[PDB]
RNA sequence: UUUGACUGGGGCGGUACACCUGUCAAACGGUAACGCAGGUGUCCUAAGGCGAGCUCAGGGAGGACAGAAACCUCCCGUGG
């Protein structure tokens, strides 16, 4: 019926903790993200200097990491369990991606540690079909055709099919 | 003994006094007014040299606190 190469999959899961300042909190936030995924994350600096937010330019204010494959699949399940497998209809972008936030990281089955603290984090899911890497390869770089593109509706349906989730208006 | 020069008289003023960009300038080049709009006496151990990878400004959509503005992601983006 459907081509096997049109199957939607998790291209990557992007986890971001924007602490907003450099020092104890960012270092501890990195440990939260590191032990949630097993991957050492990277520090994002501030592009501007905003007086309201108390951030200067070239100051590490956030910690983020990218996970792929089965490890990204199972972390995503923990996130939807916390969200009770339901998302608002507006959580889906027009490019076939969606995301959600977690207020407390220990809701993801992570033991709390007093010397670390409690943290929130941001989950962004990038979907895709086989062949999306042509836009990323160095040689013969190509742009995906219009039909391959994942529309907002086909991302919402995939969420309903896989995690039997709920879409709220 | 000296107490510059240019200058729509000289003085005051300015530097058109050594230079650079665009124009004037009349499609080679050259071309003047104390013509017009500006800049220079610096700065850099990299902002020099090579190589490698990468793509920018901006905009759209989306994502806990996060909002016009913090960070993450996708998309458009001939250089804006
Ligand atoms: Mg740090
Ligand atoms: Mg004279
Ligand atoms: Mg001379
Ligand atoms: Mg000429
Ligand atoms: Mg001529
Ligand atoms: Mg000429």
PDB file of C-alpha atoms (C1' of nucleotides) and ligand atoms in Angstrom:
ATOM      1  CA  UNK A   1       0.000   0.000   0.000  1.00  0.00           C
ATOM      2  CA  UNK A   2       2.392   2.680   1.259  1.00  0.00           C
ATOM      3  CA  UNK A   3       6.045   2.779   0.302  1.00  0.00           C
ATOM      4  CA  UNK A   4       8.329   1.570   3.124  1.00  0.00           C
ATOM      5  CA  UNK A   5      10.524   4.629   2.524  1.00  0.00           C
ATOM      6  CA  UNK A   6       7.664   6.991   3.443  1.00  0.00           C
ATOM      7  CA  UNK A   7       7.662   5.821   7.072  1.00  0.00           C
ATOM      8  CA  UNK A   8       7.877   8.593   9.661  1.00  0.00           C
ATOM      9  CA  UNK A   9      10.594   8.280  12.283  1.00  0.00           C
ATOM     10  CA  UNK A  10      12.362  10.219  15.026  1.00  0.00           C
ATOM     11  CA  UNK A  11      15.136  12.130  13.279  1.00  0.00           C
ATOM     12  CA  UNK A  12      16.332  13.494  16.619  1.00  0.00           C
ATOM     13  CA  UNK A  13      15.153  14.641  20.029  1.00  0.00           C
ATOM     14  CA  UNK A  14      16.543  17.976  21.202  1.00  0.00           C
ATOM     15  CA  UNK A  15      16.683  18.674  24.939  1.00  0.00           C
ATOM     16  CA  UNK A  16      17.329  22.248  26.118  1.00  0.00           C
ATOM     17  CA  UNK A  17      17.699  23.725  29.629  1.00  0.00           C
ATOM     18  CA  UNK A  18      17.907  27.529  29.531  1.00  0.00           C
ATOM     19  CA  UNK A  19      19.085  28.363  33.043  1.00  0.00           C
ATOM     20  CA  UNK A  20      19.755  32.026  32.286  1.00  0.00           C
ATOM     21  CA  UNK A  21      23.069  32.450  34.110  1.00  0.00           C
ATOM     22  CA  UNK A  22      26.568  30.984  34.313  1.00  0.00           C
ATOM     23  CA  UNK A  23      27.976  29.287  37.385  1.00  0.00           C
ATOM     24  CA  UNK A  24      26.532  26.786  39.841  1.00  0.00           C
ATOM     25  CA  UNK A  25      23.139  26.346  38.183  1.00  0.00           C
ATOM     26  CA  UNK A  26      24.447  25.743  34.624  1.00  0.00           C
ATOM     27  CA  UNK A  27      27.072  23.243  35.849  1.00  0.00           C
ATOM     28  CA  UNK A  28      24.399  21.326  37.780  1.00  0.00           C
ATOM     29  CA  UNK A  29      21.934  21.575  34.875  1.00  0.00           C
ATOM     30  CA  UNK A  30      24.526  19.933  32.630  1.00  0.00           C
ATOM     31  CA  UNK A  31      24.738  17.006  35.051  1.00  0.00           C
ATOM     32  CA  UNK A  32      20.949  16.637  34.894  1.00  0.00           C
ATOM     33  CA  UNK A  33      20.990  16.510  31.109  1.00  0.00           C
ATOM     34  CA  UNK A  34      24.099  14.318  31.036  1.00  0.00           C
ATOM     35  CA  UNK A  35      22.669  11.639  33.325  1.00  0.00           C
ATOM     36  CA  UNK A  36      19.266  11.720  31.621  1.00  0.00           C
ATOM     37  CA  UNK A  37      20.793  10.839  28.239  1.00  0.00           C
ATOM     38  CA  UNK A  38      24.285   9.530  28.968  1.00  0.00           C
ATOM     39  CA  UNK A  39      25.733  12.190  26.645  1.00  0.00           C
ATOM     40  CA  UNK A  40      27.821  15.145  27.751  1.00  0.00           C
ATOM     41  CA  UNK A  41      25.857  18.227  26.625  1.00  0.00           C
ATOM     42  CA  UNK A  42      27.115  21.557  25.299  1.00  0.00           C
ATOM     43  CA  UNK A  43      26.825  25.103  26.619  1.00  0.00           C
ATOM     44  CA  UNK A  44      25.065  27.777  24.564  1.00  0.00           C
ATOM     45  CA  UNK A  45      26.134  31.387  24.989  1.00  0.00           C
ATOM     46  CA  UNK A  46      24.034  34.542  24.877  1.00  0.00           C
ATOM     47  CA  UNK A  47      24.098  36.385  21.563  1.00  0.00           C
ATOM     48  CA  UNK A  48      23.099  39.721  23.144  1.00  0.00           C
ATOM     49  CA  UNK A  49      23.421  41.539  26.461  1.00  0.00           C
ATOM     50  CA  UNK A  50      19.967  41.984  28.000  1.00  0.00           C
ATOM     51  CA  UNK A  51      19.762  44.031  31.193  1.00  0.00           C
ATOM     52  CA  UNK A  52      16.296  42.699  32.037  1.00  0.00           C
ATOM     53  CA  UNK A  53      17.469  39.074  31.984  1.00  0.00           C
ATOM     54  CA  UNK A  54      20.826  39.798  33.620  1.00  0.00           C
ATOM     55  CA  UNK A  55      22.738  38.135  30.773  1.00  0.00           C
ATOM     56  CA  UNK A  56      25.826  39.424  28.985  1.00  0.00           C
ATOM     57  CA  UNK A  57      27.036  38.546  25.515  1.00  0.00           C
ATOM     58  CA  UNK A  58      29.229  35.446  25.160  1.00  0.00           C
ATOM     59  CA  UNK A  59      27.965  34.165  28.519  1.00  0.00           C
ATOM     60  CA  UNK A  60      26.966  30.520  28.825  1.00  0.00           C
ATOM     61  CA  UNK A  61      23.302  30.591  29.836  1.00  0.00           C
ATOM     62  CA  UNK A  62      21.849  27.315  28.510  1.00  0.00           C
ATOM     63  CA  UNK A  63      22.699  23.628  28.272  1.00  0.00           C
ATOM     64  CA  UNK A  64      21.413  21.465  25.432  1.00  0.00           C
ATOM     65  CA  UNK A  65      22.019  18.111  23.786  1.00  0.00           C
ATOM     66  CA  UNK A  66      20.755  16.079  20.846  1.00  0.00           C
ATOM     67  CA  UNK A  67      19.767  12.421  21.088  1.00  0.00           C
ATOM     68  CA  UNK A  68      18.968  10.050  18.242  1.00  0.00           C
ATOM     69  CA  UNK A  69      17.831   6.493  17.691  1.00  0.00           C
ATOM     70  CA  UNK A  70      16.421   4.168  20.330  1.00  0.00           C
ATOM     71  CA  UNK A  71      17.808   6.303  23.160  1.00  0.00           C
ATOM     72  CA  UNK A  72      15.833   9.260  21.826  1.00  0.00           C
ATOM     73  CA  UNK A  73      12.728   7.037  21.456  1.00  0.00           C
ATOM     74  CA  UNK A  74      12.732   5.923  25.075  1.00  0.00           C
ATOM     75  CA  UNK A  75      13.410   9.405  26.469  1.00  0.00           C
ATOM     76  CA  UNK A  76      10.467  10.635  24.407  1.00  0.00           C
ATOM     77  CA  UNK A  77       8.171   8.038  25.984  1.00  0.00           C
ATOM     78  CA  UNK A  78       9.113   9.265  29.459  1.00  0.00           C
ATOM     79  CA  UNK A  79       8.268  12.806  28.389  1.00  0.00           C
ATOM     80  CA  UNK A  80       4.829  11.884  27.062  1.00  0.00           C
ATOM     81  CA  UNK A  81       4.110   9.823  30.175  1.00  0.00           C
ATOM     82  CA  UNK A  82       4.695  12.963  32.244  1.00  0.00           C
ATOM     83  CA  UNK A  83       2.483  14.856  29.794  1.00  0.00           C
ATOM     84  CA  UNK A  84      -0.047  11.985  30.031  1.00  0.00           C
ATOM     85  CA  UNK A  85       0.314  11.349  26.278  1.00  0.00           C
ATOM     86  CA  UNK A  86      -1.582  14.487  25.320  1.00  0.00           C
ATOM     87  CA  UNK A  87      -0.567  17.707  23.581  1.00  0.00           C
ATOM     88  CA  UNK A  88      -2.289  20.836  22.339  1.00  0.00           C
ATOM     89  CA  UNK A  89      -2.981  21.074  18.617  1.00  0.00           C
ATOM     90  CA  UNK A  90      -0.717  24.148  18.440  1.00  0.00           C
ATOM     91  CA  UNK A  91       2.331  22.194  19.733  1.00  0.00           C
ATOM     92  CA  UNK A  92       2.924  21.029  16.143  1.00  0.00           C
ATOM     93  CA  UNK A  93       4.880  23.259  13.782  1.00  0.00           C
ATOM     94  CA  UNK A  94       4.031  23.585  10.102  1.00  0.00           C
ATOM     95  CA  UNK A  95       7.233  21.694   9.201  1.00  0.00           C
ATOM     96  CA  UNK A  96       6.027  18.469  10.812  1.00  0.00           C
ATOM     97  CA  UNK A  97       7.729  18.815  14.193  1.00  0.00           C
ATOM     98  CA  UNK A  98       6.397  19.270  17.706  1.00  0.00           C
ATOM     99  CA  UNK A  99       7.670  19.887  21.212  1.00  0.00           C
ATOM    100  CA  UNK A 100       6.617  20.113  24.876  1.00  0.00           C
ATOM    101  CA  UNK A 101       8.104  21.169  28.226  1.00  0.00           C
ATOM    102  CA  UNK A 102       8.751  19.372  31.518  1.00  0.00           C
ATOM    103  CA  UNK A 103       8.567  21.393  34.726  1.00  0.00           C
ATOM    104  CA  UNK A 104      10.548  18.994  36.945  1.00  0.00           C
ATOM    105  CA  UNK A 105      13.171  16.598  35.629  1.00  0.00           C
ATOM    106  CA  UNK A 106      12.691  13.958  38.336  1.00  0.00           C
ATOM    107  CA  UNK A 107       9.287  13.236  36.799  1.00  0.00           C
ATOM    108  CA  UNK A 108      11.295  11.397  34.111  1.00  0.00           C
ATOM    109  CA  UNK A 109      12.284   8.571  36.459  1.00  0.00           C
ATOM    110  CA  UNK A 110      15.490  10.289  37.588  1.00  0.00           C
ATOM    111  CA  UNK A 111      16.459  10.110  41.250  1.00  0.00           C
ATOM    112  CA  UNK A 112      16.754  13.542  42.826  1.00  0.00           C
ATOM    113  CA  UNK A 113      20.053  14.549  44.399  1.00  0.00           C
ATOM    114  CA  UNK A 114      20.321  17.426  46.911  1.00  0.00           C
ATOM    115  CA  UNK A 115      23.708  18.492  45.504  1.00  0.00           C
ATOM    116  CA  UNK A 116      22.081  18.866  42.059  1.00  0.00           C
ATOM    117  CA  UNK A 117      18.575  20.264  42.503  1.00  0.00           C
ATOM    118  CA  UNK A 118      15.385  20.130  40.475  1.00  0.00           C
ATOM    119  CA  UNK A 119      15.272  21.405  36.902  1.00  0.00           C
ATOM    120  CA  UNK A 120      12.904  21.896  34.012  1.00  0.00           C
ATOM    121  CA  UNK A 121      13.832  21.146  30.434  1.00  0.00           C
ATOM    122  CA  UNK A 122      12.482  21.573  26.888  1.00  0.00           C
ATOM    123  CA  UNK A 123      11.798  18.613  24.532  1.00  0.00           C
ATOM    124  CA  UNK A 124      11.711  19.167  20.750  1.00  0.00           C
ATOM    125  CA  UNK A 125      10.947  16.238  18.451  1.00  0.00           C
ATOM    126  CA  UNK A 126      12.148  16.396  14.852  1.00  0.00           C
ATOM    127  CA  UNK A 127      10.353  13.899  12.641  1.00  0.00           C
ATOM    128  CA  UNK A 128      11.452  12.675   9.245  1.00  0.00           C
ATOM    129  CA  UNK A 129      11.202  10.012   6.576  1.00  0.00           C
ATOM    130  CA  UNK A 130      14.135   7.918   5.071  1.00  0.00           C
ATOM    131  CA  UNK A 131      16.174  10.093   2.753  1.00  0.00           C
ATOM    132  CA  UNK A 132      16.063  13.353   4.712  1.00  0.00           C
ATOM    133  CA  UNK A 133      19.851  13.225   5.074  1.00  0.00           C
ATOM    134  CA  UNK A 134      20.315  14.346   1.457  1.00  0.00           C
ATOM    135  CA  UNK A 135      19.846  17.928   2.664  1.00  0.00           C
ATOM    136  CA  UNK A 136      22.759  17.370   5.064  1.00  0.00           C
ATOM    137  CA  UNK A 137      25.375  15.437   3.084  1.00  0.00           C
ATOM    138  CA  UNK A 138      28.365  17.372   1.781  1.00  0.00           C
ATOM    139  CA  UNK A 139      28.512  15.809  -1.696  1.00  0.00           C
ATOM    140  CA  UNK A 140      25.556  16.051  -4.107  1.00  0.00           C
ATOM    141  CA  UNK A 141      23.542  17.919  -1.464  1.00  0.00           C
ATOM    142  CA  UNK A 142      19.892  17.788  -2.467  1.00  0.00           C
ATOM    143  CA  UNK A 143      16.599  19.310  -1.298  1.00  0.00           C
ATOM    144  CA  UNK A 144      13.727  16.915  -0.409  1.00  0.00           C
ATOM    145  CA  UNK A 145      10.745  16.865  -2.828  1.00  0.00           C
ATOM    146  CA  UNK A 146       7.375  18.408  -1.829  1.00  0.00           C
ATOM    147  CA  UNK A 147       5.590  15.036  -1.336  1.00  0.00           C
ATOM    148  CA  UNK A 148       8.258  13.725   1.096  1.00  0.00           C
ATOM    149  CA  UNK A 149       7.703  16.752   3.377  1.00  0.00           C
ATOM    150  CA  UNK A 150       5.864  15.941   6.660  1.00  0.00           C
ATOM    151  CA  UNK A 151       2.802  18.249   6.954  1.00  0.00           C
ATOM    152  CA  UNK A 152       1.418  19.332  10.326  1.00  0.00           C
ATOM    153  CA  UNK A 153      -1.502  16.921   9.923  1.00  0.00           C
ATOM    154  CA  UNK A 154       0.750  13.911   9.207  1.00  0.00           C
ATOM    155  CA  UNK A 155       2.860  14.723  12.326  1.00  0.00           C
ATOM    156  CA  UNK A 156      -0.296  14.892  14.447  1.00  0.00           C
ATOM    157  CA  UNK A 157      -1.573  11.597  13.038  1.00  0.00           C
ATOM    158  CA  UNK A 158       1.777   9.901  13.633  1.00  0.00           C
ATOM    159  CA  UNK A 159       1.618  10.983  17.276  1.00  0.00           C
ATOM    160  CA  UNK A 160      -1.882   9.522  17.543  1.00  0.00           C
ATOM    161  CA  UNK A 161      -0.803   6.292  15.853  1.00  0.00           C
ATOM    162  CA  UNK A 162       2.399   5.621  17.785  1.00  0.00           C
ATOM    163  CA  UNK A 163       1.797   6.881  21.329  1.00  0.00           C
ATOM    164  CA  UNK A 164      -2.036   6.768  21.031  1.00  0.00           C
ATOM    165  CA  UNK A 165      -1.885  10.362  22.214  1.00  0.00           C
ATOM    166  CA  UNK A 166      -4.554  13.016  22.593  1.00  0.00           C
ATOM    167  CA  UNK A 167      -4.731  16.262  20.624  1.00  0.00           C
ATOM    168  CA  UNK A 168      -6.447  19.077  22.473  1.00  0.00           C
ATOM    169  CA  UNK A 169      -7.883  22.042  20.508  1.00  0.00           C
TER     170      UNK A 169
ATOM    171  C1'   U B   1      66.431  89.421  13.504  1.00  0.00           C
ATOM    172  C1'   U B   2      61.790  87.190  12.370  1.00  0.00           C
ATOM    173  C1'   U B   3      56.614  87.487  12.765  1.00  0.00           C
ATOM    174  C1'   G B   4      54.247  81.414   6.217  1.00  0.00           C
ATOM    175  C1'   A B   5      50.910  80.674   1.993  1.00  0.00           C
ATOM    176  C1'   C B   6      46.151  80.306  -0.414  1.00  0.00           C
ATOM    177  C1'   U B   7      42.178  83.894  -0.429  1.00  0.00           C
ATOM    178  C1'   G B   8      36.113  86.841  -5.540  1.00  0.00           C
ATOM    179  C1'   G B   9      40.882  93.217  -1.809  1.00  0.00           C
ATOM    180  C1'   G B  10      43.248  92.345   2.939  1.00  0.00           C
ATOM    181  C1'   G B  11      42.039  90.837   8.230  1.00  0.00           C
ATOM    182  C1'   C B  12      38.866  87.295  11.006  1.00  0.00           C
ATOM    183  C1'   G B  13      37.522  82.366   9.246  1.00  0.00           C
ATOM    184  C1'   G B  14      38.700  77.910   6.513  1.00  0.00           C
ATOM    185  C1'   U B  15      42.647  74.619   4.624  1.00  0.00           C
ATOM    186  C1'   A B  16      40.382  73.673  -0.855  1.00  0.00           C
ATOM    187  C1'   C B  17      48.791  73.361   1.945  1.00  0.00           C
ATOM    188  C1'   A B  18      50.369  66.108   2.148  1.00  0.00           C
ATOM    189  C1'   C B  19      46.656  62.334   1.085  1.00  0.00           C
ATOM    190  C1'   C B  20      41.816  58.709   0.127  1.00  0.00           C
ATOM    191  C1'   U B  21      36.191  57.516  -1.807  1.00  0.00           C
ATOM    192  C1'   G B  22      31.763  58.858  -4.629  1.00  0.00           C
ATOM    193  C1'   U B  23      30.403  62.974  -7.784  1.00  0.00           C
ATOM    194  C1'   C B  24      31.282  67.143 -10.841  1.00  0.00           C
ATOM    195  C1'   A B  25      33.608  65.082 -15.610  1.00  0.00           C
ATOM    196  C1'   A B  26      30.429  65.962 -21.077  1.00  0.00           C
ATOM    197  C1'   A B  27      30.503  56.461 -21.718  1.00  0.00           C
ATOM    198  C1'   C B  28      39.276  55.841 -22.876  1.00  0.00           C
ATOM    199  C1'   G B  29      42.414  58.562 -19.791  1.00  0.00           C
ATOM    200  C1'   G B  30      43.202  63.750 -18.092  1.00  0.00           C
ATOM    201  C1'   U B  31      40.235  68.039 -16.369  1.00  0.00           C
ATOM    202  C1'   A B  32      38.961  73.744 -12.344  1.00  0.00           C
ATOM    203  C1'   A B  33      36.595  76.931  -8.199  1.00  0.00           C
ATOM    204  C1'   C B  34      36.829  78.932  -0.489  1.00  0.00           C
ATOM    205  C1'   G B  35      32.290  73.129  -6.098  1.00  0.00           C
ATOM    206  C1'   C B  36      29.042  69.053  -3.684  1.00  0.00           C
ATOM    207  C1'   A B  37      28.838  64.481   0.144  1.00  0.00           C
ATOM    208  C1'   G B  38      32.519  62.337   3.216  1.00  0.00           C
ATOM    209  C1'   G B  39      37.212  60.307   5.321  1.00  0.00           C
ATOM    210  C1'   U B  40      42.857  60.218   6.993  1.00  0.00           C
ATOM    211  C1'   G B  41      47.902  61.097  10.704  1.00  0.00           C
ATOM    212  C1'   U B  42      45.076  55.481  13.109  1.00  0.00           C
ATOM    213  C1'   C B  43      43.981  49.892  14.196  1.00  0.00           C
ATOM    214  C1'   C B  44      45.675  44.486  14.118  1.00  0.00           C
ATOM    215  C1'   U B  45      50.230  38.370  16.959  1.00  0.00           C
ATOM    216  C1'   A B  46      45.801  38.548  14.170  1.00  0.00           C
ATOM    217  C1'   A B  47      42.134  41.643  11.961  1.00  0.00           C
ATOM    218  C1'   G B  48      49.118  38.584   9.008  1.00  0.00           C
ATOM    219  C1'   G B  49      49.884  33.175   6.495  1.00  0.00           C
ATOM    220  C1'   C B  50      47.925  28.411   5.202  1.00  0.00           C
ATOM    221  C1'   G B  51      44.343  24.633   5.657  1.00  0.00           C
ATOM    222  C1'   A B  52      39.800  22.583   7.226  1.00  0.00           C
ATOM    223  C1'   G B  53      34.693  22.622   8.264  1.00  0.00           C
ATOM    224  C1'   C B  54      30.593  26.044   7.974  1.00  0.00           C
ATOM    225  C1'   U B  55      26.853  29.939   6.095  1.00  0.00           C
ATOM    226  C1'   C B  56      25.208  35.049   6.738  1.00  0.00           C
ATOM    227  C1'   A B  57      20.948  39.622   7.539  1.00  0.00           C
ATOM    228  C1'   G B  58      16.029  38.941   8.011  1.00  0.00           C
ATOM    229  C1'   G B  59      11.363  36.360   8.244  1.00  0.00           C
ATOM    230  C1'   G B  60       7.726  32.177   9.280  1.00  0.00           C
ATOM    231  C1'   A B  61       6.261  28.117  12.506  1.00  0.00           C
ATOM    232  C1'   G B  62       7.048  25.596  17.019  1.00  0.00           C
ATOM    233  C1'   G B  63       9.100  24.544  22.109  1.00  0.00           C
ATOM    234  C1'   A B  64       8.615  24.688  30.725  1.00  0.00           C
ATOM    235  C1'   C B  65       9.449  29.158  33.560  1.00  0.00           C
ATOM    236  C1'   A B  66      10.301  32.754  28.781  1.00  0.00           C
ATOM    237  C1'   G B  67       7.250  37.900  27.933  1.00  0.00           C
ATOM    238  C1'   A B  68       8.660  42.539  22.105  1.00  0.00           C
ATOM    239  C1'   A B  69      13.444  40.769  23.628  1.00  0.00           C
ATOM    240  C1'   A B  70      17.467  34.887  26.907  1.00  0.00           C
ATOM    241  C1'   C B  71      18.075  29.438  24.639  1.00  0.00           C
ATOM    242  C1'   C B  72      16.650  24.975  21.515  1.00  0.00           C
ATOM    243  C1'   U B  73      14.463  23.035  16.480  1.00  0.00           C
ATOM    244  C1'   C B  74      12.676  23.000  11.504  1.00  0.00           C
ATOM    245  C1'   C B  75      11.605  25.857   7.089  1.00  0.00           C
ATOM    246  C1'   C B  76      12.426  30.086   3.419  1.00  0.00           C
ATOM    247  C1'   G B  77      16.522  33.041   2.686  1.00  0.00           C
ATOM    248  C1'   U B  78      21.590  35.924  -4.157  1.00  0.00           C
ATOM    249  C1'   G B  79      23.823  38.112   0.391  1.00  0.00           C
ATOM    250  C1'   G B  80      19.089  42.171   1.677  1.00  0.00           C
TER     251        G B  80
HETATM  252 MG1  LIG C   1      29.795  26.684  33.396  1.00  0.00          MG
HETATM  253 MG1  LIG C   2      48.465  86.672   1.361  1.00  0.00          MG
HETATM  254 MG1  LIG C   3      53.449  67.867  -3.791  1.00  0.00          MG
HETATM  255 MG1  LIG C   4      34.214  60.801 -15.653  1.00  0.00          MG
HETATM  256 MG1  LIG C   5      35.268  62.119 -22.617  1.00  0.00          MG
HETATM  257 MG1  LIG C   6      36.398  59.741 -18.213  1.00  0.00          MG
END
